[PDB]
Design a protein around this ligand. Structure first.
Ligand code: FDA
Ligand SMILES: *[C@@H]1O[C@H](CO)[C@@H](O[C@@H]2O[C@H](CO)[C@@H](O)[C@H](O)[C@H]2NC(C)=O)[C@H](O)[C@H]1NC(C)=O
Ligand code: 479
Ligand code: NAG
Ligand code: NAG
Ligand code: NAG
Ligand code: NAG
Ligand code: MG
Ligand code: NA
Length: 585
C-alpha cells in the first residue's frame, strides 16, 4: 500500500514523485518500463551522444498515407528519466500564446502567466563565461530564468566557427538575434539552452535532477524494468495497478494506492494503459471485449509530433573545425576528447551533430509574401476533412477548436511554426513545429506486451505541406546569403538548386520527411469532454476518481518549440495541484 502510484518514470513521473515525497508522510511508487541507465559516456557526455541505448523496441508506424505510404521506426524512451535520459538536451519553453490557447480551450488556470513561476521553479540556469557570451552573441534575461530549481541548464563552452557564418546569414534574411527565447517569444536566432550541469559538463536528466538528488528518501520507491498493464477500480475509483516484467515473464502483481494513480507513460504509453483499463472509445473496447469503465472517444486520438527534414549539402570551402571533423578526423576527435577529459573544454560539450545556435520563425516571417494565402486555404477547409469520416463528433469539435487557435497563431508575428538549424557539417535540419495533421495510437489486442497501432498521419492535412515548403525556402535563403556563400554550399541530391517550384521541392520532402522527433503528445488531451477531451483542467480523467495524466499525453497541441522544458514545468504545476487537493506538505 502506497499513497500514490505513478505509471512511468520519465520526465513527468520523476518530477511529480520528487515533489510529492517532499512530504515524509507521502509514499510514492514509480513503476518504470526501462532500467536505470549505467552513467555510460553515451548518456552523460554531450559529444558521445548515443540515444539508441534506451529506445523502446519493436515500435513501427502504419504506412503513412501523407508520405508515400512509408512505414517508419517509432522512437520513444524506455529508461528511468524517459526522454530526458536520451534526448538532444534542447531546453526551450513554448511561446506565451501556446499556454494562453490551452486556457482558452476551456481550461481554467492555464496561461503563460500561471506557467512562468513553474518554469522558474523547475530549474537553475548557469550563465556561460563572459568571453563566450560576447564572442558567441549569447544573451538571456536573468529575471525569467530560474536560479534555485533542480534541472541544471546552461550552454556548451565552445562553438564551431561556421556557426558564425550561419548566424550572420540568418540575420541577412530576416532572422534577427533574440534577447531570450525563454521569455515567451523566439522570432529569429539564439543560442540553444542545453540541459547540462556546467560543473561536470554532463547531462542533467530527470534520473539525476528528480531521483538521484533525493534518493536518500525512504518514501520515494522505484521499480524499474516493469510495465503497468492495467488500472484497478472499486466502481469508478482508481485504487491500484497490475504490473508485469517488461521482459514478458508470465507474472502479474497488484499494488494499491490510498490517494491516486498517476499515468506518466508518455504519448505512446498512457493511452494504452487507459484503453487496456476500459477507459477509451467504446467502439475499440467493444471490438476487443474490454468492459467499458469510461467511454472517452478522445483516448488515443489527436496524436501529434514535430516532423523533421534533413537537407544534405556539399561545400567547396567549409571552415575547419566543424561537427564533421569529429567523425572524419581521428586526430581532431582524440584531441577534443583529451581536452574534455582534462579541462572539460571544447567540442565534446556540444551534443554530437548539433551546433550552438538555432532559428525559429512565425508563418509571416517564413512566408512574408504568401502567409495570407496559406491562412485563407486553412480557414476555407472544414476541420472535419483532417480526420477520417466517422470520427466521433466530440473529437471533431475539439480538433476544430485547436485548429481555430492554430490559425490565430498563423496570424501572430510572435508565435513560431518552424525551426532551422545547421550542425556546421553536411546537413541542415528544418522542423515543422505546428502541424494541423492528427494521428492515432490504439491497442490492437488485450495483451499488455503487444505494441499499439501507431499512425502519425503526417502530411494528411494538405496545409502542412504549404507551411513546410515555406520553411524549406527560408532555409534556402540562409544558405544563399553572403555570409554562407563564402563557404560555397550547394544542396545535394535529392535536393538541388534545380528544384525551383513548390511541386518539385515538396515531391522530395514527401519522400524524406520524418513524422517524428520523438515529440509524441496530445493523445489524452486536456479539453472539455464534449470537445473529445480525456482530462479536466486539473488533469483528472473524465468519469473516474483518483486518476490523472501527468505526461505530455495531456497537451491539446504542440508548442512553439521542443517539449522537454514544459514536461518538467507542467509536472511542477501538477505536484502543487495534487498537494492542494490532498492537503500535503
Ligand atoms: C531521442 C529523443 C530525442 C529528443 C526527445 C525525445 C527522444 C526520445 N525529445 C522529446 C522529449 O524528451 C519528450 O517529449 C519528453 O521526455 C516527454 O516527457 P513525458 O514525461 O511525457 O514522457 P517520457 O517519454 O519522458 O517518459 C515516459 C516513460 O514511461 C515509460 N512507460 C511507458 N509505458 C509504460 C508502462 N505501461 N508502464 C511503465 N512505464 C511505462 C517509458 O519507459 C518512459 O520512460 C526532446 N525534447 C526536447 O525538448 N529536447 C530535445 O532535445 C529532445 N530530443
Ligand atoms: C544545479 O542547480 C542546483 C540547484 O540550484 C545547484 O545547487 C546549489 O549549489 C550550490 C553550490 O554548490 C549550493 O551552495 C546550494 O546549496 C545548492 N542548492 C540546491 C538546492 O541544491 C547547483 O549548483 C547547480 N549546478 C551548477 C553548475 O550551478
Ligand atoms: C528523435 C531524435 N531527436 C533528437 O535527437 C532531437 C534533435 C534536436 O532537437 C535538434 C537537433 C539539432 C538541433 S535541435 C533523433 C535521434 C537520432 C537521430 N535523429 C533524431
Ligand atoms: C498508398 O496506398 C493506398 C492504398 O491504401 C493507395 O490508394 C495510394 O495510391 C498509395 N499512395 C501512394 C502515393 O502510392
Ligand atoms: C555575433 O554578432 C555580431 C554582430 O553583432 C557578428 O559580427 C558576429 O560575427 C557574431 N558572432 C557569432 C559567433 O554569432
Ligand atoms: C501463465 O500462468 C497461468 C497460471 O499458471 C496460466 O494459466 C497461463 O497458461 C500462463 N500463460 C503463459 C503464456 O504461460
Ligand atoms: C585534423 O585535425 C588536426 C587536429 O586539430 C588538424 O591539425 C589537422 O589539420 C586536421 N586534418 C585535416 C585534414 O583537416
Ligand atoms: Mg560565471
Ligand atoms: Na473525473
Amino acid at each position: 500500500n502506497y499513497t500514490f502510484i505513478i505509471a512511468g518514470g520519465g520526465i513527468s513521473g520523476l518530477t511529480l514523485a520528487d515533489r510529492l515525497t517532499e512530504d515524509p508522510r507521502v509514499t510514492v511508487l514509480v513503476i518504470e518500463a526501462g532500467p536505470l541507465d549505467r552513467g555510460e559516456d553515451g548518456i552523460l557526455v554531450p559529444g558521445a551522444f548515443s540515444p539508441w541505448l534506451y529506445f523502446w523496441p519493436g515500435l513501427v508506424s502504419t504506412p503513412q498515407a501523407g508520405l508515400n505510404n512509408r512505414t517508419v521506426d517509432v522512437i520513444t524512451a524506455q529508461v528511468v528519466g524517459g526522454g530526458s535520459t536520451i534526448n538532444a538536451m534542447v531546453y526551450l519553453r513554448g511561446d506565451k500564446d501556446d499556454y494562453d490557447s490551452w486556457g482558452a480551450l476551456g481550461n481554467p488556470g492555464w496561461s503563460w502567466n500561471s506557467m512562468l513561476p513553474y518554469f522558474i521553479k523547475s530549474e537553475t540556469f548557469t550563465p556561460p563565461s563572459p568571453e563566450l557570451a560576447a564572442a558567441g552573441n549569447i544573451t538571456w534575461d536573468g529575471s525569467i530564468r530560474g536560479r534555485s530549481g533542480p534541472v541544471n541548464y546552461s550552454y556548451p563552452n565552445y562553438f564551431f566557427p561556421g556557426s558564425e557564418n550561419w548566424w550572420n546569414a540568418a540575420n541577412e534574411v530576416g532572422l534577427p538575434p533574440v534577447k531570450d527565447p525563454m521569455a515567451g517569444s523566439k522570432q529569429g536566432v539564439f543560442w540553444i539552452p542545453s540541459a547540462i550541469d556546467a560543473r561536470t559538463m554532463t547531462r542533467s536528466h530527470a534520473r539525476r535532477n528528480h531521483y538521484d538528488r533525493v534518493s536518500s528518501r525512504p518514501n520515494y520507491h522505484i521499480l524499474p524494468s516493469h510495465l503497468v498493464s492495467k488500472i484497478l477500480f472499486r466502481g469508478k475509483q482508481a485504487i491500484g495497478v497490475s504490473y508485469i516484467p517488461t521482459s514478458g515473464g508470465n507474472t502479474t502483481t497488484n499494488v494499491y494506492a490510498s490517494k491516486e494513480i498517476t499515468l506518466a507513460a508518455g504519448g505512446l504509453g498512457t493511452p494504452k494503459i487507459l484503453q487496456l483499463s476500459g477507459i477509451g472509445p467504446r467502439k475499440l473496447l467493444n471490438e476487443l471485449g474490454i468492459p467499458v469503465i469510461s467511454d472517452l472517444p478522445g483516448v488515443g486520438q489527436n496524436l501529434q509530433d514535430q516532423p523533421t527534414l534533413t537537407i544534405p549539402y556539399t561545400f567547396t570551402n567549409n571552415v575547419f573545425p566543424n561537427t564533421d571533423s569529429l567523425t572524419t578526423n581521428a586526430t581532431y576527435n582524440a584531441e577534443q576528447r583529451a581536452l574534455y577529459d582534462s579541462s572539460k573544454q571544447g567540442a565534446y560539450t556540444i551534443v554530437n551533430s548539433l551546433s550552438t545556435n538555432i532559428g525559429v520563425m512565425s508563418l509571416q516571417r517564413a512566408a512574408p509574401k504568401s502567409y495570407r494565402q496559406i491562412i485563407a486555404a486553412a480557414r476555407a477547409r472544414s476541420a472535419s476533412l483532417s480526420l477520417p469520416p466517422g470520427t466521433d463528433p466530440a473529437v471533431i469539435r475539439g480538433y476544430q477548436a485547436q485548429r481555430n487557435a492554430i490559425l490565430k497563431q498563423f496570424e501572430n508575428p510572435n508565435v513560431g511554426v518552424g525551426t532551422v538549424h545547421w550542425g556546421t557539417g553536411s546537413s541542415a535540419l528544418v522542423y515543422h513545429l505546428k502541424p494541423l495533421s492528427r494521428g492515432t495510437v490504439n491497442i490492437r489486442s488485450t495483451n499488455p506486451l503487444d505494441a499499439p497501432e501507431i499512425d502519425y498521419r503526417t502530411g494528411t492535412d494538405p496545409i502542412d505541406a504549404q507551411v513546410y515548403t515555406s520553411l524549406f525556402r527560408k532555409n534556402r535563403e540562409i544558405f544563399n546569403a553572403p555570409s554562407m556563400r563564402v563557404l560555397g554550399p550547394s544542396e545535394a541530391a535529392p535536393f538541388g538548386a534545380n528544384l525551383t517550384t513548390d511541386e518539385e521541392i515538396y515531391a522530395v520532402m514527401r519522400e524524406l520527411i520524418n513524422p517524428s522527433n520523438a515529440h509524441q503528445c496530445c493523445t489524452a488531451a486536456m479539453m472539455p469532454k464534449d470537445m473529445g477531451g480525456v482530462v479536466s483542467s486539473e488533469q483528472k480523467v473524465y468519469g473516474v476518481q483518483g486518476l490523472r495524466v501527468a505526461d505530455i499525453s495531456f497537451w491539446p497541441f504542440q508548442l512553439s518549440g521542443s517539449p522537454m522544458a514544459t514536461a518538467y514545468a507542467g509536472a511542477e504545476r501538477l505536484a502543487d495541484v495534487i498537494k492542494k487537493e490532498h492537503r500535503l506538505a
